[model samples]
Target: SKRPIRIIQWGCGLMGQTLIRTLREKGAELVGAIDHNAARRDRDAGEVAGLGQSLGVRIHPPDQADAVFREARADVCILCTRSIMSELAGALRVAARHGVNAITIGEEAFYPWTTSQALTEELDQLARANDCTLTGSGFQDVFAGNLITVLAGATHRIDRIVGLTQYNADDYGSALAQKHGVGLDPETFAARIGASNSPSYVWNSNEWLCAQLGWRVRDIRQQLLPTTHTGTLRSASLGREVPAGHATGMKAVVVTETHEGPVIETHCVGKLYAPGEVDLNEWTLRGEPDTTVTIRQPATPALTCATVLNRLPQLLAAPPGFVTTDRFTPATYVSRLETEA
Candidate 1:
């Protein structure tokens, strides 16, 4: 007998919308949505996903999540909530208790060198105890660099990898752009990246994954270069030093060095949808020639969500644990395809 898969979306934000839209567009049935805010839950989940007004799915308040999960017999859980540190772990734990694999946008990438072994082990145990697989993926790390690198390994053994991304910001996403003070003037932006400040963007996860892959990484750095913009600010000002009222733009350069040399570099200095050049993803190996790929990822949030959903089948079959995109084999990848029975 054939049965429609059931999924639980933890956050009804932008990324959450993308996942729902994609699943619905691809003919998957959505059980319901969970959000702390009651206002949005009152609306139709389908229309919110940009899928028009007829899916007939309702948004469930946070208090109703457990019941909804149990009632729908959900097989997958997708977490797109932002500031993913506090409630994220708890949400994943709950999903495991319900016997569902959990996926998230928790980290930029799964670089081993940049994270604590204790924390990683703890997360692994949580998933393993429940016989569930937990994974995190996003455009910058998973699709742009890691996915392509993993794909390249199909034909050749890779010794190293590098990624580059550049893009413009018109119609760009405020949520993504706002994180690094996208509108801040030069002085305020510089101060925000204090010498002691942690690498703000997705660099830590990249470091974490590199270490997991046995790559001895040396350093990862972010530098704020000058960028000129004629645009006005949309968000609140970062501070007075930034007279542009915080809507101004500046250059962002990130680089990573492994034992072999520089392995990752990225540059972005425009609106989320504005005109700009991004390297997207690329890599280099010892014996094989270099390969570079450009990613026009305006729909990246959607794509990442889809990637997680698409991997649900394999996740269900794999040993329970926290996993990364780079760990799967070609056979395993095929076994997890969305079209599989």
Candidate 2:
């Protein structure tokens, strides 16, 4: 109803393209776009996203990111760049330095303290110094941390919390397809894992929940295993049939035990598989009056983009710091747009 929240979208890839199409109709204004691709630079943001129209905002190269940030005077920036934190640390610093709040789909950024505490602190301090907020969010955090936390409110004497999430990796595009090893042999899959390929990216979801519940973690362990094809499967992205016994995807399980002995388990499995298979998030708590929650939905790029877009208002209203999903009450904040008939 009021002035729209001005936004600069950084990165115009799959998720970025979805944001471009969605933001125009949401409760936000797309002011600028930044991408590393030379072809996209200087092109209309809308046209670049194949929206069939121009939004009067041309995409800029990363070299001009600061100038674009200042020109847009954005209230916030939606970063859908690479998932690794270090790779985007410079961009994050730039946003913070400009006093602009940011929300990212970066997996490692979602819980940087777990892997890069020093960088996390630096970003936190930078954002705080400018009176802005930097947040890491996505569907996994929303499902595992936020949703589970909400469900936990209904139960008492909490003992164990288990979350199972599944996704169709083929739907996530080529980069993610390769990351999930959608068509790799067993030996290659093992090598990739040894080379630090990640099967899942939300281990800190459990840790964040633990902190929210005031439970100190005593031990945390993770295991990654390849998802063997149930049978011969053809990957839409790879465009090749993967024989049985090859790696079709990956399954990850992370377990966290609190000092008080309560355990939290997060299980995520994703890959290319049979038709009718869908993306899902299921949480079960084994405690007083046990509880369970399930979200039977597709984890598409569009939905992931919407997840962060819905939270822009909340992130703007939040206190300055590196806010994680668990810190916010009423976890899933879905912002919507109204239209006149």
Candidate 3:
């Protein structure tokens, strides 16, 4: 029998807090914690995570990551940080250099190869050279990839796969809110998010699913439709009340064409939720039999955290490289993932 899996937490923000709670449920050993906030540092890891009981691990700043990693020799770094690959690339480099396997819940990381090939190759090389495994996961692991693939099993034919999902911008903080273009005017939102060619989470998910289905991508197209309200609304992440008719966030659509003739289209609404708004994941396959499935409400943040935690065992056993979630076995819920039996 092996000992509990050691963990080094990176970032102490919204998703980071959820991951802290999720990791505790797995009986993981929190060996070190990293955060940028001065106030969050020098505090008990549990206290900063609001876990009530101290884990005997004091939070440290980014500059001291090597010191903590060297002393702890953690098996994995549970990174609940940035969604962009460019921003996350630096952190991945640092963790991989220390030979610590890392699984980040970054949106872009879910499947970054198609969009960020250069950075992906660099990260892959760094991880492989250092004998470390790096992966990107989160909510997309399940709803966007695994679930869609499973649903296809019962379908007799599929001309196209369609997915629609939504999450509250407020659930995450400014990083995600800013990515969604929340609280920006229509013109600003267009010039910024619209002008950018980077694919959103759904874009990567389509690629991941197509890969699983043995479909080669022919082409892909994406659009960002700003969601505006006639009434003013407050955004916790934006730290301001968005003006009426300004953008609250966006309704995004991504379409993927495969060489095999199948199409994948996904729509996502990431924004500050108004009253009566709830998160949902719904999908439909159009073809001979027209199949559909819907999850009324999903625990996105928790699922994302749990998905990353449950994959720790496989990631540790995996060969060192920048592995993607789609490359792992289908997402599964293991009762106790910390121990090696």
Q: Model 2, poorest ten-residue lDDT window? A: 332-341
Candidate 2 — number of clashing residue pairs? 0
**Consecutive 10-residue window with the lowest summed lDDT within model 3:** 332-341
> 143-196 in candidate 2: lDDT tens per residue?
766677767778887788888888887665555666577778888888886357
If scored against the real structure, what TM-score would every candidate get? 0.75, 0.89, 0.97
Residues 1-341 of candidate 1: C-alpha lDDT, one tens digit per residue: 34455777777766788878776555566876787665577677777777766667677777777886778667678877643333466676677777677777655323322344554567678778877787665554455445554655563555555544444433233434554456555666667633334343446545644644566668878775444445433432222222333535545566667885436554544332223433243333433655555554545445556666666666666678877655553222222224234
Q: Against the correct fold, how does model 3 do in TM-score?
A: 0.97
Could you list the CA RMSD of all candidates, in the order they appear?
A: 4.8, 3.3, 1.4
Superior by TM-score: candidate 2 or candidate 3: 3
Question: Is 2 or 3 the stronger prediction by lDDT?
Answer: 3
List the global CA lDDT of all models.
Answer: 0.57, 0.79, 0.86
Over 113-230, each residue of candidate 3 has an lDDT whose tens digit, in order, gives: 8788999999999999999999988888888988888888888989999999999888887778888889888888889988984578788888889877889999999998788877
| Segments in model 3 whose C-alpha atoms lie over 4 Å from true places | 339-341
Candidate 2 global lDDT: 0.79
Ranking of predictions according to lDDT: 3, 2, 1
